[PDB]
User: What shape does this take?
Amino acid sequence: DKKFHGILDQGEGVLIIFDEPPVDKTYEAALETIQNMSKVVDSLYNKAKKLT
Amino acid sequence: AVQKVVVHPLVLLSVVDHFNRIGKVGNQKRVVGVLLGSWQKKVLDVSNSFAVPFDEDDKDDSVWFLDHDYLENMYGMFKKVNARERIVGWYHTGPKLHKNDIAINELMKRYCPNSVLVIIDVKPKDLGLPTEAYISVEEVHDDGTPTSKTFEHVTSEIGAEEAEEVGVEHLLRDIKDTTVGTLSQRITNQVHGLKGLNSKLLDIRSYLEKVATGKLPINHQIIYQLQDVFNLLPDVSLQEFVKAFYLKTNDQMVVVYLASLIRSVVALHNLINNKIANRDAEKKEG
Amino acid sequence: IDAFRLINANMMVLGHEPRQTTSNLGHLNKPSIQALIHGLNRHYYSITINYRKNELEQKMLLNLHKKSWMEGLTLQDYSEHCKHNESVVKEMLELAKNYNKAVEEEDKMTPEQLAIKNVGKQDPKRHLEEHVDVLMTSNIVQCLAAMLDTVVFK
Amino acid sequence: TRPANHRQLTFEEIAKSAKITVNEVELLVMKALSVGLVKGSIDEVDKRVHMTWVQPRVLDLQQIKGMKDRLEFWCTDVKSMEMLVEHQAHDILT
Amino acid sequence: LLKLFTTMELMRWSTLVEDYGMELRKGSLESPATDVFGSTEEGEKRWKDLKNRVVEHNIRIMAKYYTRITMKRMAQLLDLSVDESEAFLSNLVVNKTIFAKVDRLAGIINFQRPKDPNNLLNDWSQKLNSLMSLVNKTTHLIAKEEMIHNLQ
Assistant: This one.
C-alpha cells in the first residue's frame, strides 16, 4: 500500500529498507514528445500523399 | 575589507590619455594620478579620476613627488562641481608594481582611511583581464618582522551605466564582434581559458627553476603553499567516478537526441511547403 | 552627435564654400527635415565628424568584456542544469501538443489570411526553434567543459 | 611518503612504525585529527585509515627537482591537449 | 571541566567520577553540586542526565571521524551492553540529531550518507573550481612579489 519503502526476504527473514529516487522525469517527458512527433509526421504524410 | 571594486569604463581611458600626454619621452615615465569613487558599501564603486605630477629616478627608488598643493586645489574644484563625489584612492600605470609603491599609499591614507590603489596596464601583452587592484594590510610574521606590510589581491570588474554603454559600444563599430553568436564565444572561452592555464605554468616554472639552483631566496613562502596545490589534484579516473560520467552524461545525450529529432522534422516541413509552392505556381503559370 | 559652424548673413548671395570635393556634400546624410526647419542652410552650415584612434587605446577598447580562465572553466551546477532541462522539455511537450493541431489544420485561406489570424496568441514553429537552440547550447558546453576538466587535470 | 596513490593506509603500518598496539591506533589518529594536522577518516570493517589532507612541510633541493618534473610533465600535457582542440576546429570558431 | 568541551579529549565517565567524586560533597562552596547531585530526587535525574550528556558527547565525534564502526567496538568504547547501545542510537535518530543506520545482521554500521552522482560530480567540480584555479591565481601574485624584494 506504499506506506513504506522496504522489501522482505523469505529465505533470510530479513527486512531491507532503501530510499526513493526522484530521477525518472526527463525520460518520462521524453517519450511523450515522440508520441506527438509521431502524429505531425503523419500529418505531413498525407500532406505529401494528397499532393506531391 | 572591500572584497571587490567596480570600475566604470570612463577611466581605463582617462588614464591612457595622460600616458599619451607625457608619452613623448618614450623610454620610461610612470603615470600616477588620483582615483575618485564612492564610499558605497562593503562593495565599493569607482567613477572618476584625474592626474597629479610625479617623477622618480632609476636608482635609489626613494626620490618621488606628489604635489599636495595640486592635489588640494584640483580636488577642491571637483568637490565644487560635484558634491556627490569624493576621493577613494589612486592609481599608477606600471605593468608590474615597483618597490616605491608602498610609501605612496602611506602618504594618502590621511585622505581616505582605506586608500586603495588600482594598477592598470597600457600594454596588456596578456590577452586576459587587465586592471587589477590591491589594498595594504599588516601580516606580522613568525620571522620577527616589526611590520610585515604588503598589499593584498582584491578582485575587480568593469562597471556599467546606461549612458556610457551607449558611447562605448558606438565606438566598438570600428571592429567586428560576435556578442550575439551563441557557442562561438563559448569555444573561444575555453581557448581563452586554457591559454591562461598555460601562461601561469610557464611563469611558475621560471620562478621554480631559479629558486632550485644558483640564486633565489628559498624562503617559507610559496614553496609549501604551492605544495598544497598538488595535494588536491583529483584522481579523476578511479572506482566510483566512472559512474558519474556514465549516469549523467547520457542524461544530457538524450535531451540532445530529443532536440535533433524535432529539428529534423521542422526542416522537413520546409521541404513539402516549398515543393507544393514550387510546382503548383508552375503548373498554373503554364 | 552634431556640430555646426556659423555663417554670415552679409554673404547670403555670394558663395560661402568653394566646394572642391564631394566629402562634405552628399555624405553622411542629406540634412534632416527637423533640423533644416530652423537651420540648414540658413544662418550656418553643418560640418562632418569622424573618429581618430590611437593604437594604444584601440587595443584596450577591444578587450574589456572578457574574463579570466575561471569563467571559462566553470561547470554551472548539475542539479539546476538537470532541473533546467527538466523544465524546458516539459513545456516543449505542450508546444508539441499545439503544433500537431495547427499544422494539420491549414484552412485553405490564401495564407496572408493565415498571416492575420496568427497575430494574437498563436505561436507554433517559433518557440519550437527557440527552445531547441537553448537545449542545444546549454548541453553541449556543459558536456564539453566537463570533458576538458578530466583530460587536462591529472 | 606515498604520493597519494593508495594513501588509505591500514592500521598495521601505523601500529608498526609507531610501535603501539592495534587497539590504540584509533585513539592515536583521532588525536591528530582533533588537533588538526590531518583531515582523513577511519574505517573499521577493513580498519583502513583513509588520508585526504596533509599539512605542508619544509622541503629542499631534490624535492624541488621532482616537483619541476611534476610541473613540466603537467605543463606540456595541457599545451598538447589544448592544441588538439584548436586543431580539431580551425575555421569553425572564427 | 574544559575537558568535556571539544573533541572528547578522549574521555570516560568512570575516569570522570574518579576526578569529580569530591566536587559533589567536599570543597569550600559545595552548594550548587549538592543541588545538582546531593539531593536525592534531583540528583537521580541529574545523575542519569549526566550519563545522557556524556554518551551524547561521544556519538557526535564518532559521526565526525568514522566511515564505519563495528557493533562490538562501540559497546566497548561506551562501556555498556550491545542492547543499551541500540537504545542510545534509536532515540537520537528519532531525534534525527545524529543520522545512522544500524545494520545488525552483520553489526557493521555506518555514519556516512548515501551520495548522488548529482552530488558526487558536484563535489568533484567544487574542489576543481575553488581550490585548483583560485589558489593557482594566488601563487602567481606572490611569485610576482618575490621579484620586487630580490632583484635588484
Q: What stands out?
A: Chain D touches chain B at residues 4, 53-54, 56-59, 61, 64-65, 67-68, 70-72, 74-75, 78-79, 82, 85-86, 89, 92-94 (CB under 8 Å).
